[PDB]
Write a structure and sequence with these properties.
The PDB classes it as hydrolase. Keywords: yel038w, UTR4 protein (Unknown transcript 4 protein), Structural Genomics, PSI, Protein Structure Initiative, Joint Center for Structural Genomics, jcsg, hydrolase. The N and C termini lie close together (8 Å). The protein has helices at 18-37, 44-50, 57-69, 75-90, 100-108, 120-128, 153-156, 162-172, 186-193; strands at 5-8, 112-115, 149-151, 179-183, 198-202, 218-219. The relative contact order is 0.17. The protein has 9 helices and 6 strands. It is globular and about 55 Å long. The chain has 225 residues and is an alpha/beta fold. It has a 6-stranded parallel beta sheet with strand order 3-2-1-4-5-6, sandwiched between helices. It binds magnesium ion. Residues 9, 11-13, 183-185 line the site of magnesium ion.
Length: 225
């Protein structure tokens, strides 16, 4: 095809932007009280919880819920989230709603890398438990065997800085002209375009509107790519 490699944003690009707020955050916040109130010092979750450095369980419970409500990027929160979400996914309580055409795209393209604000471990977990478009309530699908790599803010830098894309090109080992980057955020695409990577503006139901006067090619789905 036109490109050797594809770089994909997650939220608003391959997954509905509604997933994190309608499903992941509420799932996690509903589980918090039980895990905090049950206090066995020797647990794998107990080691995570101790890294908040708050001994009072009422204060700890309130603090965790505050961090979620204020969208605070605390790595101890992300680990706690990872632990709760892993069990949610493994138990079948949650499934990642990847668009049917994004599933097909990932399965057919030869070189596919993910770049997201979520950590690499969280991305791998999301792509391991994908909702089956043919039967949402049946078993989830594993797309990890179709993904060649994952990038996050820690591995590569901020999504709006050109340098971050230079870091990804180094790790991908591809000429910038051979890479297409798909994202719903124009500021990400602008950063990518600074190092010569081709760009495409993903448009999905629930995303912020696309202004009439805008420079990027718009993709409503990935069937034509
Ligand atoms: Mg996005």
């Amino acid at each position: 095809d036109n490109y050797s490699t594809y770089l994909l944003d997650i939220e608003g690009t391959v997954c509905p932007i509604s997933f994190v707020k309608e499903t992941l955050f509420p799932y996690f916040t509903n589980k918090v009280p039980q895990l905090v109130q049950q206090d066995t010092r020797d647990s794998p979750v107990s080691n995570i919880l101790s890294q908040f450095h708050i001994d009072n369980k009422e204060q700890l419970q309130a603090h965790i819920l505050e961090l979620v409500a204020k969208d605070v990027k605390d790595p101890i929160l992300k680990q706690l989230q990872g632990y709760v979400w892993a069990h949610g996914y493994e138990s079948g309580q949650i499934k990642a709603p990847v668009y049917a055409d994004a599933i097909d795209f990932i399965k057919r393209k030869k070189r596919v890398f993910i770049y997201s604000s979520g950590s690499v471990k969280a991305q791998k977990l999301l792509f391991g438990y994908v909702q089956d478009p043919n039967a949402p309530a049946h078993d989830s699908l594993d797309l990890n065997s179709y993904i060649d790599g994952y990038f996050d803010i820690n591995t590569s830098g901020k999504k709006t800085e050109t340098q971050s894309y230079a870091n990804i090109l180094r790790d991908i080992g591809a000429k910038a002209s051979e890479v297409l980057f798909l994202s719903d955020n124009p500021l990400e695409l602008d950063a990518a375009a600074g190092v010569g990577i081709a760009t495409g503006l993903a448009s999905r139901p629930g995303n912020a509107p696309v202004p009439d006067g805008q420079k990027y090619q718009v993709y409503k789905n990935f069937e034509t790519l």
